[PDB]
């Protein structure tokens, strides 16, 4: 009964309003460091020279951004993949210039969101739950792994990471399609199949359960009060929803098993976003999308342009214009 | 036209030999509905 | 003891008869010389 | 190229690495013969 | 019991695929559109509308095939096969983009027919028509993009084409020309779609990991028969899991599943409002306050002005090929190019 | 009726698919649209 | 459970493959002879590999008209 | 040819499963 | 910089030793 | 016919390999037939790579991942990564593929014919998953064997031919590594290296001395860790720190393999010593420094003043400084200034690149290697079109480095997911709620409220 077994009685306790857990002894101080440093960098970070060529990019709000154009600008290309903590720099103003706040945020966010995943395991193990809400969170977490760490590692610089910003994200998407042809990558296409299907099967499952709610209330109050929390009766008729959706397409396209239904709701966006994060993680090492430039040619040999040749001219448009001053050489290798 | 008589000739040979095997099985189903 | 020419037969065949026709057509495209 | 006493059996080698992809698919043939019981 | 009642019996007859009254409007039109996509992506060129290869017959693959839009000279011609442009000729009609309007109008009528089906089946099985209400978001996306957006533009040519890479053209078109990422109505759609895909993944894995042990086997899917009236999962544990993991949790299972209806349907309805604005080229292209700042200060760079430099790249490099009717002859020196690329 | 084992149908209709998509993926490299 | 013959009972019945061993290959052959005998290049107007361009000309034969547009395609085809 | 290899390589997978079905073996 | 480096280093290892010891301090035991 | 429906096992057909958890003879044949599949692929791919092999073309220009591994070992390659005998490649293909039938026999034998459990026929081979000292005995047996395997590499490096050295003098040559780094402050100083840029945790091993001596150190601690785990039982701090289940040890292996796949991805992407660019192609770093060199070479050959030549931005177009001060290659390749290859160490003096070693001292083999490495960058498509995403279909090139890093990232991420799957499950299984929550004793209704 020392203050260690009293400490593990607090850390592992389910009686906490917000569960700590042992993963949360890493998750809380990393993600508070990644949240305090984020909003300070989002409002007051002086402009970061991301591309290493002494042209600073204003990201913060005080320097003439709004929330849409605001960002934490990624660390300098002069740094590359180098570890840039505060103690690497001679001053703070040097650390602020070369994008050190980006490396502070993403190393505290990814280490803290990895420990969000095991904290999601840990509460499932304290509660007696089955454990795989962590496995489903590995789909957005690999995505955060990819665009913050893995795509920098393959490309050799944290300047290639996704900027912590709304329009910095759109910069990251445009440049990625210019260099890696992400739309023609099938792993991104399985990811769009994971999020379009995910939004479909959300609105599907959301509307078939709402369609099938048993009358418990009057039309003079909300149907939401037909559910009382913790009730043992199912609040909607699963046989009617299967009877509805089975007649909607055909009977055998339909999950008349609620558990087999919610595995599919679990697995379709998760395996979708898994493959999409594997899209970014494999286009980290420049395993680009499908390159059908000048594929259809005629009998003479004249290139008959396709829709993938129209994308290629748009891809050319972004890539000759991304980082207009950073390239001194004709091939964009990394 | 000759080519449309070669695109449709295995097709008309398909449906005929398809209807040559369910021929009594069609006369049993139309009769049962009627 | 079942029907043969149902509505489902028309749902099956109006999709799957041109599907096989198209798959024979796309497989003939794989041998078009340039 | 293979050593020249082996080029008779060269179309065999050209499809020899498809065999491990088909062991995975054979478990589904074997599971379908037993009806996935 | 006359012929309308008798046709009501046979249409609402309990069969494998339910026909219904909507199947008179759904089942040809949904099948002509999808049958016309496959007919156009296999056999129909875009060599006169776009100057493109877009069928399997020409050499394109599934990614690169499309039923491409009509030419800009057609305008918003309905392009009926009997109409004044095709003049009856099927061979000419496919070349003039007539199969695009065949798919965009039968697919329009089939989507009415599928949405009417969702009403008709819910009226017969006795349930609420929320799946039809949730299907209003794919209608409004199909209506705004494939119909309302070209109707606001100069022709059907600027609508998206029914193809994988041709949609990818259309996505990269809207970045370069419209800056559609920056539009707030598209962000509400991204928040709605990714929120839907999150709420699909979260609610799917929450239910599947709060299940009650109803069977003595280690594969839990056979612990559910559908005629049971028990909750198959512990909504109490699920609420206590998410209250301590995330901070907030659903406690109403009816409000949870309405929120699953609400979030992708409001997102896809918000993206509709942006595309209707983009039909009139009402973009959120520029924050006027920043391009005032950046045009008299040559050191103020944000990621916003970098995206606008990318859009000038898209609008000048893609357009002499993307828009062949305009006869854009852009020399090798008017092209916006950074250093060394 | 149940004369043919359904797995034999399911193992050769599923082999009709990979022959054809294997023929479709070969014609990516042969003839039209092969960039050659 | 609606009335029709189950799909475990149709495709497994040999009478199915009495019908369908001679109709599924027949339509695959019909579709082959759509493309191989050239009818695909004539129903829909998709050009042959020697029909995108005239011999010296390399312009795109692009439609610039609406009500003079069916005759315009034919002018491009008489060019070939 | 490469195909007649991959045909008999491929066919003789399920023929193991065909024999043990038509011999009532330990499938 | 010289001081904040070892300040962060002690903070990191104390939270990491709290991570490693608490999962070594009978985490299989703490199940319902 | 035990554990073969869901009536007897409680596992479905899609988790039907989980029916073999307590079937030691059947789980052995599962593993030996799968071991036969890896050794089949090792055999059949090597044959497929050597039947479709052009010894004129370099190995990276041919989609070869396994011929570069045999070539790195010092087999059938001479000066500068050039094949002089394809027979050591062919033997590795035949000895693996023929051995796959023996493991295929023994996998099929133990799975579908042998005793279903080994616990009756052989108490030495029969194991319980929750027997902790037996589970280290098999761990100790397998540690000694991997210590034997990490000493075979030392044997091939020190006696039986030597490995291919990229840092051999005058270009690359197969070199007998006769003085390996036995110093543990160097061998385990790699372990305390930062993973990040310029340090590159163990991927920065840049000579074959530390490779051989590191495999003497690993190869003998695995022997001495085998003798450890054979002669001991797990201690009490470890018994309370682990789930002792079959799926638990699987999850610990899956989590270990996710580490290894993410590391080997980084080895094949960054390291050009144990993955020579003669065989595997230039690294991502290597090709960007080769492009800056080719135009450092080209323009100075036209008389550019390459030290004083400026970029658009104020930086050196050819020669700028790293943020530590070294004269490095200008351009965007400033991110790759931590790259060491042997075609540019004759340029690197102590300030970084020496400008006086650029003017009158760049040899034509270096101009050849930099121009080759620039036009064979590990950029490529999924249909194997070389170059950027905006490149035309003329170059049929994806590097083996890109193939190996991306495949072993796809595999290593899923093996992290598979670790999270199986570690969560095996701890839910050892506590007794992996099948669901008991309704009669639900913990949360026995757990107090929050607010
Ligand atoms: C299917 C709908 C077809 C359609 O829409 O076809 C459009 C036609 C109008 O035809 C267009 O008309 C335009 C205006 O032309 C006029 O002006 C030009 C210059 O003045 C020309 O000289 C020309 O001679 C003259 O007619 C252009 O010429 C185009 O070629 C032509 O597409 O209207 C019509 O059939 C009927 C339209 C009236 C009802 C509108 C329903 C549309 C729903 C709302 C969308 C509105 C757009 C805003 C988006 C937000
Ligand atoms: C956490 C961040 C891990 C990471 O940044 O992952 C990257 C590191 C690899 O580090 C890289 O490693 C390289 C080391 O190679 C050096 O040594 C090599 C020896 O041939 C070559 O000489 C090479 O050219 C030379 O640069 C460079 O130093 C890079 O700058 C450095 O970032 O992977 C690792 O070791 C750690 C394992 C990472 C697994 C994936 C996550
Ligand atoms: C699928 C059907 C198919 O179209 O298969 C076609 C190919 C055979 O096609 C040949 O594919 C070749 C691929 O090029 C490879 O080989 C070439 C030289 O032969 C070049 O050297 C090139 O660099 C190298 O990539 C060539 O392009 C040939 O032209 C072409 O005939 O079969 C194969 O390769 C089968 C390979 C299966 C195993 C691949 C696993 C590893 C791939 C990475 C996975 C994870 C990464 C994420 C990806 C997203
Ligand atoms: C390659 C990976 C692999 C391996 C090694 C195995 C191995 C096994 N599975 Mg598993 N399984 C796998 C993948 C694999 N499976 C996949 C992908 C699925 C999903 C379809 C399953 C689903 C599954 C289920 C549902 C079950 C198994 C079972 C089994 C075990 C016994 C099978 C048996 O005795 O019935 C007899 C099997 C047959 C008659 C099929 C014959 C196949 C032969 C052996 C093919 C190999 C021949 C080979 C080429 C010859 C080489 C030697 C030669 C050169 C001399 C065996 C250990 C069973 C089990 O749990 O046992 C208790 C079981 O019920 N598996
Ligand atoms: C060496 C690695 C390895 C090994 C031995 C296993 C072994 C097992 N897995 Mg695991 N798994 C792994 C990696 C591994 N897995 C990885 C990398 C992932 C992430 C993709 C998973 C994700 C996973 C899930 C989601 C499940 C399993 C399951 C299982 C069990 C049955 C598998 C089966 O019959 O599928 C047959 C093969 C197929 C259906 C086709 C595969 C394509 C078996 C104990 C099942 C289980 O938990 O039972 C205890 C299960 O539900 N695995
Ligand atoms: C590392 C893989 C491995 C392991 C641990 C085993 C282990 C075993 N084998 Mg197997 N086996 C293997 C691979 C393996 N085998 C291979 C590759 C082959 C083909 C040569 C065989 C062919 C084989 C046969 C024919 C028999 C065994 C038998 C045995 C058991 C007794 C060994 C003995 O004393 O002689 C033991 C469980 C014996 C057994 O199972 O007893 C009934 C037995 O009769 N093995
Ligand atoms: C790579 C294969 C391998 C595997 C799977 C194992 C597995 C095991 N080892 Mg062994 N070991 C191995 C190789 C291996 N060992 C080798 C090659 C050596 C020689 C260097 C050893 C030397 C060794 C000793 C001396 C001991 C073990 C022990 C153990 C058991 C506890 C594991 C543990 O909690 O460490 C996970 C890592 C930690 C707990 C350290 C966390 C970081 C610390 C806190 C930092 C500060 C110090 C586990 C069965 C223990 C045991 O139970 O003996 C039978 C034990 O006392 N191993
Ligand atoms: C899809 C299945 C698959 C395939 C086809 C491959 C294929 C490959 N892997 Mg991968 N691997 C896979 C799955 C797969 N892997 C998975 C799922 C993981 C976990 C994520 C890994 C983890 C992994 C790692 C860590 C590494 C590989 C590596 C490799 C490559 C060389 C393999 C090798 O040399 O083994 C070696 C064979 C053995 C270790 C068996 C013992 C051989 C002895 C010790 C050799 C002694 C030689 C000596 C001369 C003897 C003297 C006589 C090869 C392309 C290597 C690579 O180069 O990656 C870039 C590598 O380092 N793999
Ligand atoms: C080396 C060599 C050899 C060997 C070989 C081998 C080893 C083989 C094996 C092979 C195999 C191993 C094969 C297999 C095959 C299989 C297959 C071909 C399958 C397919 C499948 C499918 C088609 C599927 C289907 C299905 C089902 C059935 C269920 C439902 C669903 C699905 C679709 C999944 C020989 C002798 C030649 C000689 C010498 C050389
Ligand atoms: C060969 C070679 C080399 C060497 C190397 C080495 C020497 C290595 C080693 C390595 C090592 C030696 C490593 C280690 C690692 C470790 C790990 C990986 C760990 C893990 C851990 C764990 C898993 C734990 C867990 C836990 C916790 C956290 C708490 C609770 C309890 C438990 C126990 C569960 C060099 C580089 C020189 C060169 C190249 C070649
Ligand atoms: O940094 Mn951001 O983006 Ca990847 O590519 Mn090279 O570097 Mn720059 O150009 Mn394109
Ligand atoms: Fe639900």
Coordinates of N, CA and C in Angstrom, one line a residue, chain A residues 112-242:
Chain A
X112 N 1.2 10.6 -29.1 CA 0.0 10.6 -28.3 C -1.2 10.0 -28.9
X113 N -1.3 10.0 -30.2 CA -2.4 9.3 -30.8 C -2.2 7.8 -31.0
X114 N -0.9 7.4 -31.1 CA -0.6 6.0 -30.9 C -1.1 5.5 -29.5
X115 N -0.8 6.3 -28.5 CA -1.2 6.0 -27.2 C -2.7 6.3 -26.9
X116 N -3.4 7.0 -27.8 CA -4.8 7.0 -27.7 C -5.4 5.6 -28.1
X117 N -4.7 4.9 -29.1 CA -5.2 3.7 -29.6 C -5.1 2.6 -28.5
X118 N -3.9 2.5 -27.8 CA -3.8 1.5 -26.7 C -4.6 1.9 -25.5
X119 N -4.9 3.2 -25.3 CA -5.8 3.6 -24.3 C -7.3 3.2 -24.6
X120 N -7.6 3.2 -25.9 CA -8.9 2.6 -26.4 C -8.9 1.1 -26.1
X121 N -7.7 0.4 -26.3 CA -7.7 -1.0 -25.9 C -7.9 -1.1 -24.4
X122 N -7.3 -0.2 -23.6 CA -7.1 -0.4 -22.2 C -8.4 -0.2 -21.5
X123 N -9.2 0.7 -21.9 CA -10.6 0.8 -21.3 C -11.4 -0.4 -21.7
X124 N -11.3 -0.9 -23.0 CA -12.0 -2.1 -23.4 C -11.6 -3.3 -22.5
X125 N -10.4 -3.4 -22.0 CA -10.0 -4.4 -21.2 C -10.4 -4.2 -19.7
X126 N -10.5 -2.9 -19.3 CA -11.0 -2.7 -17.9 C -12.5 -2.9 -17.9
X127 N -13.2 -2.6 -18.9 CA -14.7 -2.7 -19.0 C -15.1 -4.1 -19.3
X128 N -14.3 -5.0 -19.6 CA -14.7 -6.4 -20.0 C -15.2 -6.4 -21.4
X129 N -14.9 -5.4 -22.2 CA -15.3 -5.4 -23.6 C -14.4 -6.2 -24.5
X130 N -14.9 -6.5 -25.7 CA -14.1 -7.0 -26.7 C -13.2 -5.9 -27.2
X131 N -12.0 -6.2 -27.7 CA -10.9 -5.2 -27.6 C -10.7 -4.4 -28.9
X132 N -11.5 -4.5 -30.0 CA -11.0 -4.1 -31.3 C -11.6 -2.7 -31.7
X133 N -11.8 -1.8 -30.8 CA -12.1 -0.5 -31.2 C -10.7 0.2 -31.4
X134 N -9.7 -0.3 -30.8 CA -8.3 0.1 -31.1 C -7.9 -0.2 -32.6
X135 N -8.3 -1.4 -33.0 CA -8.0 -1.8 -34.4 C -8.7 -1.0 -35.4
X136 N -9.9 -0.5 -35.1 CA -10.6 0.4 -36.0 C -10.0 1.8 -36.0
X137 N -9.5 2.2 -34.9 CA -8.8 3.5 -34.8 C -7.4 3.5 -35.5
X138 N -6.9 2.3 -35.7 CA -5.7 2.2 -36.5 C -5.9 2.6 -38.0
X139 N -7.1 2.8 -38.4 CA -7.3 3.3 -39.8 C -7.1 4.8 -39.9
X140 N -7.7 5.6 -39.0 CA -7.3 7.0 -39.1 C -5.9 7.3 -38.6
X141 N -5.4 6.4 -37.7 CA -4.0 6.6 -37.1 C -2.9 6.3 -38.1
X142 N -3.1 5.3 -38.9 CA -2.2 5.0 -40.0 C -2.1 6.1 -41.0
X143 N -3.3 6.7 -41.2 CA -3.4 7.9 -42.1 C -2.7 9.1 -41.5
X144 N -2.7 9.3 -40.2 CA -1.9 10.3 -39.6 C -0.5 9.9 -39.5
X145 N -0.2 8.5 -39.4 CA 1.2 8.0 -39.5 C 1.7 8.4 -40.9
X146 N 0.9 8.2 -41.9 CA 1.4 8.3 -43.3 C 1.8 9.8 -43.7
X147 N 0.8 10.7 -43.5 CA 1.0 12.0 -44.0 C 1.9 12.9 -43.1
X148 N 2.1 12.5 -41.9 CA 3.0 13.2 -41.0 C 4.4 12.6 -40.8
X149 N 4.5 11.3 -40.9 CA 5.8 10.7 -40.6 C 6.3 9.9 -41.8
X150 N 5.4 9.1 -42.4 CA 5.9 8.1 -43.4 C 6.2 8.7 -44.7
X151 N 5.3 9.6 -45.2 CA 5.5 10.3 -46.4 C 6.7 11.3 -46.3
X152 N 6.9 11.9 -45.1 CA 8.2 12.6 -44.9 C 9.4 11.7 -45.0
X153 N 9.3 10.4 -44.4 CA 10.5 9.6 -44.4 C 10.8 9.1 -45.8
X154 N 9.8 8.7 -46.6 CA 10.1 8.3 -48.0 C 10.6 9.4 -48.8
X155 N 10.1 10.6 -48.6 CA 10.5 11.8 -49.4 C 11.7 12.5 -48.8
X156 N 12.1 12.1 -47.6 CA 13.3 12.6 -47.0 C 13.3 14.0 -46.3
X157 N 12.1 14.5 -46.0 CA 12.0 15.7 -45.3 C 10.6 15.9 -44.7
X158 N 10.6 16.4 -43.5 CA 9.3 16.8 -42.8 C 8.7 18.1 -43.4
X159 N 9.4 18.7 -44.4 CA 8.7 19.7 -45.2 C 7.6 19.1 -46.1
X160 N 7.7 17.8 -46.4 CA 6.7 17.1 -47.2 C 5.6 16.6 -46.4
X161 N 5.6 16.7 -45.1 CA 4.5 16.3 -44.3 C 3.3 17.2 -44.6
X162 N 2.1 16.7 -44.1 CA 0.9 17.5 -44.3 C 1.0 18.7 -43.3
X163 N 0.8 19.9 -43.8 CA 0.7 21.0 -42.9 C -0.5 20.9 -42.0
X164 N -0.3 21.3 -40.8 CA -1.4 21.3 -39.8 C -2.2 22.6 -40.0
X165 N -3.0 22.4 -41.0 CA -3.8 23.6 -41.5 C -4.8 23.1 -42.5
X166 N -5.8 23.9 -42.7 CA -6.9 23.6 -43.6 C -6.5 23.7 -45.0
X167 N -5.9 24.9 -45.4 CA -5.4 25.1 -46.7 C -4.0 24.5 -46.9
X168 N -3.3 24.3 -45.9 CA -2.0 23.6 -46.0 C -2.3 22.1 -46.3
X169 N -3.4 21.5 -45.8 CA -3.8 20.2 -46.3 C -4.1 20.2 -47.8
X170 N -4.8 21.2 -48.3 CA -5.1 21.3 -49.7 C -3.9 21.5 -50.5
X171 N -2.9 22.2 -50.0 CA -1.6 22.2 -50.7 C -1.0 20.8 -50.7
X172 N -1.0 20.1 -49.6 CA -0.5 18.7 -49.6 C -1.2 17.8 -50.5
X173 N -2.5 17.9 -50.7 CA -3.3 17.1 -51.6 C -3.0 17.3 -53.1
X174 N -2.8 18.6 -53.4 CA -2.6 19.0 -54.8 C -1.2 18.6 -55.3
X175 N -0.2 18.8 -54.4 CA 1.2 18.5 -54.7 C 1.3 17.0 -54.8
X176 N 0.6 16.2 -54.0 CA 0.7 14.8 -53.9 C 0.1 14.2 -55.2
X177 N -0.9 14.7 -55.8 CA -1.5 14.3 -57.0 C -0.6 14.7 -58.2
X178 N 0.1 15.8 -58.1 CA 1.0 16.2 -59.1 C 2.3 15.3 -59.2
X179 N 2.7 14.8 -58.1 CA 3.9 14.0 -58.0 C 3.7 12.5 -58.0
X180 N 2.6 12.0 -57.4 CA 2.3 10.6 -57.2 C 1.1 10.1 -57.8
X181 N 0.3 10.9 -58.5 CA -0.9 10.6 -59.2 C -1.9 9.7 -58.3
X182 N -2.2 10.3 -57.1 CA -2.9 9.6 -56.1 C -4.3 9.1 -56.5
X183 N -5.0 9.9 -57.4 CA -6.3 9.5 -57.9 C -6.2 8.2 -58.7
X184 N -5.1 8.0 -59.5 CA -4.9 6.8 -60.2 C -4.3 5.6 -59.4
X185 N -4.0 5.9 -58.1 CA -3.5 4.8 -57.2 C -4.7 4.1 -56.7
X186 N -4.8 2.7 -56.9 CA -6.0 2.0 -56.5 C -6.2 1.9 -55.0
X187 N -5.1 2.1 -54.2 CA -5.2 2.1 -52.8 C -6.0 3.4 -52.3
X188 N -5.8 4.5 -53.0 CA -6.6 5.7 -52.7 C -8.0 5.4 -53.2
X189 N -8.2 4.7 -54.3 CA -9.5 4.4 -54.9 C -10.3 3.4 -54.0
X190 N -9.6 2.5 -53.3 CA -10.2 1.7 -52.2 C -10.5 2.5 -51.0
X191 N -9.7 3.6 -50.8 CA -10.0 4.5 -49.7 C -11.2 5.3 -49.9
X192 N -11.4 5.8 -51.2 CA -12.6 6.5 -51.5 C -13.8 5.6 -51.5
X193 N -13.6 4.3 -51.9 CA -14.5 3.2 -51.7 C -14.8 3.0 -50.2
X194 N -13.8 3.3 -49.3 CA -14.0 3.2 -47.9 C -14.7 4.4 -47.3
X195 N -14.6 5.6 -47.8 CA -15.3 6.7 -47.2 C -16.6 7.0 -47.9
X196 N -16.7 6.8 -49.2 CA -18.0 6.9 -49.8 C -18.9 5.8 -49.4
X197 N -18.3 4.6 -49.3 CA -19.1 3.5 -48.7 C -19.3 3.7 -47.2
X198 N -18.3 4.2 -46.5 CA -18.5 4.5 -45.1 C -19.6 5.6 -44.9
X199 N -19.7 6.6 -45.7 CA -20.8 7.6 -45.6 C -22.1 7.0 -46.1
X200 N -22.0 6.1 -47.1 CA -23.2 5.4 -47.6 C -23.8 4.5 -46.5
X201 N -23.0 3.6 -46.0 CA -23.4 2.6 -45.0 C -23.7 3.3 -43.6
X202 N -23.2 4.5 -43.4 CA -23.6 5.3 -42.2 C -25.0 5.8 -42.4
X203 N -25.3 6.4 -43.6 CA -26.6 6.9 -43.9 C -27.6 5.8 -44.2
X204 N -27.1 4.7 -44.6 CA -27.9 3.5 -44.8 C -28.3 3.0 -43.4
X205 N -27.4 2.7 -42.5 CA -27.7 2.1 -41.2 C -28.4 3.1 -40.3
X206 N -28.0 4.4 -40.5 CA -28.7 5.4 -39.8 C -30.1 5.6 -40.2
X207 N -30.4 5.3 -41.5 CA -31.8 5.5 -41.9 C -32.6 4.2 -41.8
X208 N -32.0 3.1 -41.8 CA -32.8 1.9 -41.7 C -33.2 1.6 -40.2
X209 N -32.3 2.1 -39.3 CA -32.7 2.0 -37.9 C -33.8 3.0 -37.5
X210 N -33.6 4.2 -38.0 CA -34.6 5.3 -37.8 C -35.9 5.0 -38.5
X211 N -35.8 4.3 -39.6 CA -37.1 3.9 -40.3 C -37.8 2.8 -39.5
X212 N -37.1 2.1 -38.6 CA -37.7 0.9 -38.0 C -38.0 1.0 -36.5
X213 N -37.9 2.3 -36.0 CA -38.2 2.5 -34.6 C -39.6 2.2 -34.3
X214 N -39.8 1.4 -33.2 CA -41.1 1.1 -32.7 C -41.8 2.4 -32.1
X215 N -43.1 2.6 -32.4 CA -43.8 3.7 -31.8 C -43.8 3.5 -30.3
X216 N -43.2 4.4 -29.6 CA -43.3 4.5 -28.2 C -43.8 5.9 -27.7
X217 N -43.7 6.9 -28.6 CA -44.0 8.3 -28.3 C -45.2 8.7 -29.2
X218 N -45.6 10.0 -28.9 CA -46.6 10.7 -29.6 C -45.9 11.5 -30.7
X219 N -46.7 11.9 -31.7 CA -46.2 12.9 -32.7 C -46.0 14.3 -32.1
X220 N -46.4 14.6 -30.9 CA -46.3 15.8 -30.2 C -45.0 16.0 -29.5
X221 N -44.1 14.9 -29.4 CA -42.8 15.0 -28.9 C -41.9 14.1 -29.8
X222 N -40.6 14.2 -29.5 CA -39.6 13.6 -30.3 C -39.6 12.0 -30.2
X223 N -39.3 11.4 -31.3 CA -39.2 9.9 -31.3 C -38.0 9.4 -30.6
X224 N -37.0 10.3 -30.3 CA -35.8 10.0 -29.5 C -36.1 9.5 -28.1
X225 N -37.3 9.9 -27.5 CA -37.6 9.5 -26.2 C -38.2 8.2 -26.1
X226 N -38.4 7.5 -27.2 CA -38.8 6.1 -27.2 C -37.6 5.2 -26.7
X227 N -36.4 5.7 -26.8 CA -35.3 5.1 -26.2 C -35.1 5.7 -24.8
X228 N -35.0 4.8 -23.8 CA -34.5 5.2 -22.5 C -33.2 4.4 -22.3
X229 N -32.2 5.1 -21.8 CA -30.8 4.5 -21.8 C -30.7 3.3 -20.9
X230 N -30.1 2.3 -21.4 CA -30.0 1.0 -20.6 C -31.1 0.1 -20.8
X231 N -32.1 0.4 -21.6 CA -33.3 -0.5 -21.7 C -32.8 -1.8 -22.4
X232 N -33.6 -2.9 -22.1 CA -33.3 -4.2 -22.6 C -33.9 -4.5 -23.9
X233 N -35.1 -3.9 -24.2 CA -35.7 -4.1 -25.5 C -35.0 -3.4 -26.5
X234 N -34.9 -4.0 -27.7 CA -34.3 -3.2 -28.8 C -35.3 -2.2 -29.3
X235 N -34.7 -1.0 -29.6 CA -35.6 0.2 -29.8 C -36.2 0.2 -31.2
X236 N -35.7 -0.6 -32.1 CA -36.2 -0.7 -33.4 C -36.3 -2.1 -33.8
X237 N -37.2 -2.4 -34.8 CA -37.5 -3.7 -35.3 C -36.5 -4.1 -36.3
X238 N -35.6 -5.0 -36.0 CA -34.5 -5.4 -37.0 C -35.2 -6.2 -38.1
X239 N -36.3 -6.9 -37.9 CA -36.9 -7.7 -38.9 C -37.6 -6.8 -39.9
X240 N -38.2 -5.7 -39.5 CA -38.8 -4.7 -40.4 C -37.8 -4.1 -41.3
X241 N -36.6 -3.7 -40.7 CA -35.6 -3.0 -41.5 C -35.0 -4.0 -42.5
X242 N -34.8 -5.3 -42.1 CA -34.4 -6.3 -43.1 C -35.5 -6.6 -44.1

